[PDB]
Scaffold this active site. Structure first.
Site, PDB file in Angstrom:
ATOM      1  N   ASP A   1      11.598 -20.018   6.247  1.00 22.62           N
ATOM      2  CA  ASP A   1      10.436 -19.232   6.646  1.00 22.62           C
ATOM      3  C   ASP A   1      10.869 -18.219   7.703  1.00 22.62           C
ATOM      4  O   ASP A   1      12.063 -17.995   7.928  1.00 22.62           O
ATOM      5  CB  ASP A   1       9.297 -20.138   7.133  1.00 22.62           C
TER       6      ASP A   1
HETATM    7  P1  LIG Z   1       6.774 -17.206   9.261  1.00 21.43           P
HETATM    8  O1  LIG Z   1       6.497 -15.928   8.511  1.00 21.43           O
HETATM    9  O2  LIG Z   1       6.326 -18.440   8.531  1.00 21.43           O
HETATM   10  O3  LIG Z   1       5.890 -17.164  10.596  1.00 21.43           O
HETATM   11  C1  LIG Z   1       4.670 -17.951  10.634  1.00 21.43           C
HETATM   12  C2  LIG Z   1       3.661 -17.308  11.571  1.00 21.43           C
HETATM   13  C3  LIG Z   1       4.028 -17.618  13.020  1.00 21.43           C
HETATM   14  C4  LIG Z   1       3.701 -15.801  11.373  1.00 21.43           C
HETATM   15  C5  LIG Z   1       2.254 -17.804  11.245  1.00 21.43           C
HETATM   16  O4  LIG Z   1       2.035 -17.605   9.867  1.00 21.43           O
HETATM   17  C6  LIG Z   1       1.049 -17.333  12.046  1.00 21.43           C
HETATM   18  O5  LIG Z   1       0.765 -16.141  12.096  1.00 21.43           O
HETATM   19  N1  LIG Z   1       0.343 -18.263  12.670  1.00 21.43           N
HETATM   20  C7  LIG Z   1      -0.835 -18.010  13.481  1.00 21.43           C
HETATM   21  C8  LIG Z   1      -0.527 -17.143  14.661  1.00 21.43           C
HETATM   22  C9  LIG Z   1       0.287 -17.891  15.687  1.00 21.43           C
HETATM   23  O6  LIG Z   1       1.106 -18.713  15.344  1.00 21.43           O
HETATM   24  N2  LIG Z   1       0.085 -17.616  16.971  1.00 21.43           N
HETATM   25  C10 LIG Z   1       0.804 -18.264  18.048  1.00 21.43           C
HETATM   26  C11 LIG Z   1       1.943 -17.416  18.519  1.00 21.43           C
HETATM   27  S1  LIG Z   1       2.496 -17.676  20.220  1.00 21.43           S
HETATM   28  C12 LIG Z   1       2.528 -19.416  20.269  1.00 21.43           C
HETATM   29  O7  LIG Z   1       1.527 -20.075  20.216  1.00 21.43           O
HETATM   30  C13 LIG Z   1       3.792 -19.965  20.809  1.00 21.43           C
HETATM   31  C14 LIG Z   1       3.984 -19.504  22.191  1.00 21.43           C
HETATM   32  C15 LIG Z   1       4.582 -20.580  23.064  1.00 21.43           C
HETATM   33  C16 LIG Z   1       5.900 -20.233  23.664  1.00 21.43           C
HETATM   34  C17 LIG Z   1       5.820 -19.071  24.592  1.00 21.43           C
HETATM   35  C18 LIG Z   1       7.134 -18.696  25.188  1.00 21.43           C
HETATM   36  C19 LIG Z   1       7.066 -18.303  26.622  1.00 21.43           C
HETATM   37  C20 LIG Z   1       8.178 -18.831  27.452  1.00 21.43           C
HETATM   38  C21 LIG Z   1       9.309 -17.873  27.570  1.00 21.43           C
HETATM   39  C22 LIG Z   1       9.907 -17.831  28.920  1.00 21.43           C
HETATM   40  C23 LIG Z   1      11.109 -16.972  28.985  1.00 21.43           C
HETATM   41  C24 LIG Z   1      12.299 -17.799  29.301  1.00 21.43           C
HETATM   42  C25 LIG Z   1      12.145 -19.173  28.713  1.00 21.43           C
END
Ligand SMILES: *P(=O)(O)OCC(C)(C)[C@H](O)C(=O)NCCC(=O)NCCSC(=O)CCCCCCCCCCCCC
Ligand SMILES: CCCCCCCCCCCCCCCCCC(=O)OC[C@H](COP(=O)([O-])OCC(O)COP(=O)([O-])OC[C@@H](COC(=O)CCCCCCCCCCCCCCCCC)OC(=O)CCCCCCCCCCCCCCCCC)OC(=O)CCCCCCCCCCCCCCCCC
Ligand SMILES: CCCCCCCCCCCCCCCCCC(=O)OC[C@H](COP(=O)([O-])OCC(O)COP(=O)([O-])OC[C@@H](COC(=O)CCCCCCCCCCCCCCCCC)OC(=O)CCCCCCCCCCCCCCCCC)OC(=O)CCCCCCCCCCCCCCCCC
Ligand SMILES: CCCCCCCC/C=C/CCCCCCCC(=O)OC[C@H](COP(=O)(O)OCCN)OC(=O)CCCCCCC/C=C/CCCCCCCC
Ligand SMILES: CCCCCCCC/C=C\CCCCCCCC(=O)OC[C@H](COP(=O)(O)OCCN)OC(=O)CCCCCCC/C=C\CCCCCCCC
Ligand SMILES: CCCCCCCCCCCCCCCCCC(=O)OC[C@H](COP(=O)(O)OCCN)OC(=O)CCCCCCCCCCCCCCCCC
Lengths: 178, 52, 220, 110, 87, 125, 128, 103, 80, 67
Positions: free
Chosen positions: E42
């Site tokens: 994926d």
């Molecule tokens: P592939 O094409 O299968 O992708 C699947 C996706 C993700 C596109 C899904 O089909 C999708 O759109 N799902 C619904 C939308 C979604 O997933 N939204 C959430 C995205 S953000 C999430 O929730 C994760 C964020 C948590 C981590 C954040 C990171 C921040 C920390 C970084 C700090 C920097 C140093 C570590």
């Protein structure tokens, strides 16, 4: 760089770019490989947890909160590849790139110093001159009346043609010219 | 231009400008060799307070 | 004559010699970096000799070989101060430069302008020697600005790199603030002492004041 | 004089490391160089010991006397304290360089 | 300085990385295998594959170009074109 | 660095000495018959030896001897150990003289404080 | 939650932290499409001229011409005497002159007074 | 998502053209057609010129021109220590007095 | 010339901190699929590396022996 | 000498560089130990620091308080 941008980034593209940026900054924080593997697995676990979400508004809110978290927790000095835009070896060889139009201003003695190269150069120049009309005709035939809606370019539809607007892409200076 | 995208195929790669697009009135001072306005990891007010 | 002055001026001149050969077939060939490195090694030994002369009897000298111009009651001449500081720093700098030039022969092998790189390194060495051996404020300022511009040229070695150009100009800016301080000190010394040479400056300034000393501190 | 010597050697060692790792200047991507590069390793160790004032190396004959003069004079108390803290931090960053560049497992491309 | 790259070397290295990926079966992995159509991965898997290739070759592939590299042959062609490898 | 700084700053600076004003007592106060310091090297000898003005102290003769020894045995730069030790020992004795002066100033100041306190108590009573 | 980042003029707001980046109206998408169309039209024109084999010279940039003209020759015709312009011009053009005049006048008056009173150290001051 | 067929075809054609262009950029065995027109020996020739000639010239310049006007070359006077012999006049600078020696 | 890539089946996370990471992730309920691609870094000539104090004492073993021999020679010469 | 590049493997080292590195490390440690053996006063000092508390008032010229 090689791909024409679209009018906007989709939600999938935004979340994938955030995933890559978060992984890179986490790797910058977690210097050692085993620690990076562990925390990258945890990060992908978070992304998988929020993978399946039918509510697009909630998904966008999660993306926004994750972006804020990334900005707060970003490494002030993230790792950058030497050739990358922030890298130390970025644009070091731009002064060494010289074009072929500058190449054809040489003196006859300089050209005589390279007899075989300039014959092939003349062949390339003839190929360029014999295709420009076909390329412009193809471009003006396939464009909509309103104009180019995107920066993409078509390939050659004919057996003897060349892809329009190819000369500078094909004859661009080498990445290590000198 | 530092804020401008580096991975885009600009007509002028070093200035990060395209041919025909409007030029900012203060381009002469916003070039990559001069004043930068790109976001920083720490807020400007916090940086000023800490340095002072 | 004492070999001290002859050998010191010979070290400086043989440092300057390969720059004259930068308009020659040797500069057009691939032997120029080795040529410059060999010249620097020979200069290192030739400067080691006066160091032995000093470490025996503490010999120190000033050499005003060439008179430049006389602004009424102020005489400016090409003068060198061969004292403990000069005769100790010259061999160390020459040794370091010799090692750096060999390391650059290895390191900068793929540079299309390695000959120009070595020429710039030798020019910086010459300007630094001028700064170190200078006996008066004007010659010291000559060496000052010479090393400044050589630093500017060598930081921006890759001219296509915007970051390199910014770094070079930033170095120039800060060194120009330092030069503001330097020129303040020069003007004060000339106005209040009728001299730009260390001998008369030391003689007349029995209690040196805040304005010239703060100018020197700002330049430093 | 002493600093010219050992700092020039340290810069040369770092440059050798950079050249051997394909223009990489990141200690987060260096590693394993203690045994990967023996001579640069020993040279950088000797230089860092001289930089930090090993009791009989080239940096000892200047830094130790400088610290003794600072402690024994009619000086600014804050200046003396900052000088001592700066010596400690000198040791700290020399350790940082050695630890992140030479010790451990490789972190450079295969 | 460094030895020049070749198409065979690039292909071998990318297949090496992919065969060291656990989610990909080495036996059914060919240079024309699609990452999602016939390998069953994926978007996040493809992002991690691109990051692994970036670590392998020491250069960054921008996100605009990396999303379209859905095949080992596509990755090889992209890397060869960027590094000016013609043999 | 030292406990004297703590005593003077977080304590009684009146009882602790003042380095910029020391001594504040006559040299004969408490010393019935005190001997003036002896200088071996003459002004002309120091001028000829070109000692730095900081180095023209009461230990100048040992420094002159060390310089003469170093010049004569120039290639063997390890042959002046006895002269170096003599100069260092003379400087050490000068430093302990300075320390004795500091301690004498301190206890003279505190004795003066005790005397003035006793006089104040007698006046009150 | 996490501390907020305050944008400034010399430290702007990142795109990922912009509130409008997550509130996209259907009209925002068509505005983005129109902007992309304008960029594509300009790019196509420039690329045609740039890849023309018979072109020898400089591809004139009307945008660059407009910038250089507005920076130099279009300023006075569009300048009007307003209270803001009048006060700013008066200040920035007159105030520094009077300030430096006062500074140098005071310094030189003090120096001349010291000269007349005969208590200024002018020994060895031979060059002037 | 991925390449469109037009994008893939154009990339293939452009890559073929670029590879052919680089192959043409390769040189020929005879391509640089140039126009017609011991180790110690090199060190010896370098040493005589680069070191011997300048020292000759500079010594001649200093002895006969620079040290022909007053004060051009000034030497710090040599240090005179007690118990010495000034060579100019055969003079004997006397020793210092008896030290109050300790231990 | 024409270097050959070593066989990919030799890279394993066993006897490596990567297997500790894998065990932690398994306790978490997760897996990391890029174990071997990093496991190349923990085997072979990179298997063992010295500590910080050991690195500083790189040549002490021969240095101390030479120092002892020189001191013995100096003592013998001073005695004779 | 020509050093063949390695893929995912320890680089090819040379006996000459190995022995040179070992020799120079041993030389540094020998110099440190040899210098410490001979002149250790450069590290531990040469003369004792006197204790002012033990200096008598008689030798410091301090008279009795009553006097
Ligand atoms: P592939 O094409 O299968 O992708 C699947 C996706 C993700 C596109 C899904 O089909 C999708 O759109 N799902 C619904 C939308 C979604 O997933 N939204 C959430 C995205 S953000 C999430 O929730 C994760 C964020 C948590 C981590 C954040 C990171 C921040 C920390 C970084 C700090 C920097 C140093 C570590
Ligand atoms: C005078 C020289 C004028 C040269 C003009 C251009 C000539 C040319 O075409 O050259 C190409 C030709 C071959 O190059 P190429 O690759 O074929 O050509 C392609 C490029 O052009 C190649 O370009 P490049 O990048 O190789 O450039 C070469 C060179 C070309 O540029 C220059 O040479 C510029 C020089 C002028 C600088 C102007 C500002 C300062 C003004 C000072 C005035 C001093 C006058 C003295 C008397 C001069 C009489 C003529 O530029 C540099 O080296 C960079 C600038 C360095 C300036 C350093 C100045 C520091 C102060 C020096 C003071 C000295 C006097 C006081 C000393 C007191 C104490 C003793 O090179 C030469 O012939 C050599 C040029 C000179 C080398 C540098 C000399 C600097 C000045 C001397 C400094 C002291 C060192 C000892 C000197 C001993 C003699
Ligand atoms: C070589 C090195 C460089 C050297 C330096 C070179 C550059 C510097 C030199 C040049 C400086 C600027 C030129 C001098 C001023 C020229 C003004 C002019 O031509 O105006 C025509 C221009 C066209 O007339 P308009 O179309 O009827 O009015 C259009 C206005 O936008 C709409 O007008 P409004 O109805 O909105 O006006 C409201 C307000 C506008 O004024 C303000 O809001 C500013 C109030 C403070 C300024 C006045 C302070 C003194 C007030 C007490 C005076 C007591 C005198 C006894 O009016 C007042 O305050 C009443 C008049 C005050 C007169 C003061 C003098 C008597 O009128 C204005 O710009 C109106 C303001 C005029 C005064 C501006 C402030 C001047 C301050 C002193 C400067 C010296
Ligand atoms: C005495 C008069 C001078 C006093 C100081 C006046 C300050 C005036 C500032 C100069 C105006 C700038 C005009 C254009 C300069 C060149 C263009 C420019 O802005 O260059 C920016 C360039 C690039 O920034 P980077 O950090 O490298 O980021 C690059 C990321 N890719 O940065 C610079 O060089 C600008 C630095 C200017 C510093 C200004 C303040 C300097 C400090 C002065 C006060 C301290 C005095 C010291 C006291 C000494 C005690 C005795
Ligand atoms: C070249 C090799 C030539 C081979 C034969 C060597 C010739 C040796 C014989 C000596 C030559 C005769 C000679 O030197 O005569 C002295 C003759 C002139 O006599 P002056 O007393 O100086 O007259 C005053 C001028 N206003 O001096 C000279 O010409 C030699 C000058 C060379 C010195 C170095 C030249 C300086 C160049 C730097 C540019 C100017 C720097 C500014 C100095 C700043 C000082 C504050
Ligand atoms: C607006 C007020 C200030 C105006 C001047 C500064 C303007 C901005 C910076 C300009 C920088 C370039 C010019 C620097 C000139 C420095 C002049 C100087 O050092 O003056 C010292 C001043 C007078 O000393 P003087 O008269 O010689 O001795 C008798 C005792 N006063 O002695 C004193 O003043 C005594 C105090 C000494 C510390 C002065 C620190 C000056 C720092 C200057 C650089 C700042 C950057």
């Amino acid at each position: 760089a090689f791909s024409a941008p679209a009018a906007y980034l989709t939600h999938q593209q935004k979340v994938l770019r955030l995933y890559k940026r978060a992984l890179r900054h986490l790797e910058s924080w977690c210097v050692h490989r085993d620690k990076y593997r562990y925390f990258a697995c945890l990060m992908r676990a978070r992304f998988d947890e929020h993978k399946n979400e039918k509510d697009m508004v909630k998904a966008t809110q999660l993306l926004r909160q994750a972006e804020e978290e990334f900005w707060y927790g970003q490494h002030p000095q993230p790792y950058i590849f030497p050739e990358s835009p922030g890298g130390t070896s970025y644009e070091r060889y731009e002064c060494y790139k010289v074009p072929e139009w500058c190449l054809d201003d040489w003196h006859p003695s300089e050209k005589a110093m390279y007899p075989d190269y300039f014959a092939k150069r003349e062949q390339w120049k003839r190929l360029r001159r014999e295709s420009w009309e076909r390329e412009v005709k193809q471009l003006q035939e396939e464009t909509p009346p309103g104009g180019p809606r995107t920066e993409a370019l078509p390939p050659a539809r004919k057996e003897g043609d060349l892809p329009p607007l190819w000369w500078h892409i094909v004859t661009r200076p080498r990445e290590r010219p000198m | 231009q530092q804020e401008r995208d580096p991975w885009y195929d600009w007509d002028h790669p070093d200035l990060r400008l395209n041919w025909g697009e409007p030029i900012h009135w203060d381009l002469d001072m916003y070039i990559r060799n001069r004043v930068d306005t790109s976001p920083t990891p720490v807020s400007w007010n916090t940086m000023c307070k800490h340095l002072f | 004559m004492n070999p001290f002055a002859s050998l010191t001026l010979t070290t400086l001149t043989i440092l300057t010699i390969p720059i004259m050969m930068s308009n020659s077939n040797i500069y057009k060939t691939n032997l120029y970096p080795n040529y410059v490195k060999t010249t620097v090694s020979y200069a290192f030994t030739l400067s080691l000799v006066p160091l032995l002369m000093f470490m025996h009897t503490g010999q120190e000298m000033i050499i005003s070989n060439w008179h430049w111009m006389t602004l009424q009651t102020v005489e400016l001449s090409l003068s060198f101060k061969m004292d403990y500081f000069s005769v100790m720093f010259i061999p160390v700098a020459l040794f370091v430069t010799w090692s750096i030039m060999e390391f650059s022969m290895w390191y900068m092998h793929s540079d299309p302008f390695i000959n120009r790189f070595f020429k710039y390194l030798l020019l910086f060495l010459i300007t630094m020697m001028i700064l170190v051996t200078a006996n008066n404020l004007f010659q010291l300022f000559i060496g000052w600005e010479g090393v400044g511009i050589m630093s500017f040229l060598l930081i921006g070695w890759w001219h296509g790199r915007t970051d390199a150009n910014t770094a070079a100009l930033q170095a120039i800016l800060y060194n120009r603030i330092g030069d503001i301080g330097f020129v303040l000190s020069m003007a004060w010394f000339l106005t209040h002492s009728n001299a730009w040479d260390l001998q008369q400056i030391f003689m007349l300034n029995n209690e040196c004041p805040n304005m010239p000393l703060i100018g020197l501190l700002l330049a430093a | 004089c002493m600093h010219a010597f050992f700092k020039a050697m340290l810069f040369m060692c770092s440059g050798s490391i950079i050249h051997s790792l394909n223009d990489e200047q990141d200690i987060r991507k260096m590693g394993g160089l203690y045994k990967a590069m023996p001579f640069t390793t020993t040279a950088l160790i000797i230089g860092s010991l001289a930089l930090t004032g090993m009791p009989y190396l080239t940096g000892f004959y200047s830094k130790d006397l400088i610290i003794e003069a600072v402690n024994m004079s009619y000086t600014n108390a804050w200046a003396l304290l900052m000088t001592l803290i700066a010596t400690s931090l000198t040791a700290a960053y020399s350790t940082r360089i050695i630890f992140f560049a030479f010790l451990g497992k490789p972190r450079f491309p295969p | 300085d460094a030895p020049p790259l070749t198409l065979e070397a690039i292909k071998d290295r990318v297949l090496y990385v992919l065969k060291l990926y656990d989610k990909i079966d080495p036996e059914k992995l060919s240079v024309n295998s699609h990452f999602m159509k016939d390998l069953g991965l994926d978007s996040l898997d493809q992002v991690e594959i691109i990051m692994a290739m970036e670590d392998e070759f020491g250069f960054e592939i921008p996100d605009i170009d990396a999303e379209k590299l859905m095949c080992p042959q596509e990755i090889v062609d992209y890397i060869a074109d960027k590094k000016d490898v013609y043999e | 660095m030292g406990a004297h700084l703590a005593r003077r700053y977080l304590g009684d600076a009146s009882k602790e000495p003042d380095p910029l004003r020391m001594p504040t007592f006559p040299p004969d106060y408490g010393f019935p018959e005190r001997k003036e310091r002896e200088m071996v090297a003459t002004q002309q000898e120091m001028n000829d030896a070109q000692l730095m003005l900081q180095q023209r102290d009461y230990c100048a003769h040992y420094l002159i001897q060390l310089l003469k020894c170093k010049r004569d045995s120039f290639p063997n730069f390890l042959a002046c150990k006895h002269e170096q030790h003599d100069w260092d020992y003379c400087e050490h004795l000068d430093y302990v003289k300075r320390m004795k002066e500091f301690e004498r100033e301190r206890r003279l100041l505190q004795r003066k404080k005790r005397r003035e306190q006793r006089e104040a108590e007698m006046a009150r009573g | 939650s996490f501390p907020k980042y305050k944008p400034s003029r010399l430290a702007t707001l990142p795109a990922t932290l912009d509130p409008a980046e997550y509130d996209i109206s259907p009209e925002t998408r068509k505005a983005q499409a129109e902007r992309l169309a304008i960029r594509s039209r300009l790019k196509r024109e420039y690329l045609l001229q740039y890849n023309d084999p018979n072109r020898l010279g400089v591809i004139e940039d009307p945008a660059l011409i407009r910038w250089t003209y507005a920076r130099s020759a279009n300023i006075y015709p569009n300048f009007r005497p307003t209270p803001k312009t009048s006060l700013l011009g008066a200040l920035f053009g007159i105030g520094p002159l009077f300030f430096w005049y006062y500074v140098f006048k005071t310094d030189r008056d003090k120096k001349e007074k010291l000269i007349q009173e005969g208590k200024l150290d002018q020994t060895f001051n031979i060059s002037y | 998502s991925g390449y469109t067929p037009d994008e893939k075809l154009r990339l293939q054609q452009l890559r073929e053209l670029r590879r052919r262009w680089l192959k043409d950029q390769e040189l020929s065995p005879r391509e640089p057609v140039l126009p017609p027109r011991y180790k110690t020996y090199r060190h010896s020739i370098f040493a005589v010129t680069h070191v011997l000639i300048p020292v000759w010239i500079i010594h001649y310049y200093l002895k006969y021109h620079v040290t022909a006007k007053p004060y051009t070359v000034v030497e710090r006077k040599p240090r005179i220590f007690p118990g010495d012999t000034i060579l100019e006049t055969g003079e004997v600078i006397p020793l210092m007095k008896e030290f109050p020696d300790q231990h | 010339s024409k270097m050959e890539l070593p066989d990919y089946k030799q890279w394993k996370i066993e006897g490596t901190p990567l297997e500790t990471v894998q065990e932690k992730l398994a306790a978490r309920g997760l897996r990391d699929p890029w174990g071997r691609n990093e496991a190349w870094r923990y085997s072979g000539g990179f298997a063992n590396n010295v500590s910080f104090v050991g690195a500083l004492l790189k040549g002490f073993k021969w240095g101390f022996a030479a120092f002892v021999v020189a001191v013995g020679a100096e003592y013998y010469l001073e005695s004779q | 000498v020509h050093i063949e590049p390695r893929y995912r493997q320890f680089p090819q080292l040379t006996r000459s560089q190995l022995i040179q590195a070992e020799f120079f490390s041993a030389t540094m440690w020998f110099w440190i130990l040899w210098r410490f053996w001979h002149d250790s006063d450069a590290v531990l000092g040469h003369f004792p620091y006197p204790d002012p508390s033990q200096w008598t008032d008689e030798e410091l010229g301090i008279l009795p308080d009553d006097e």
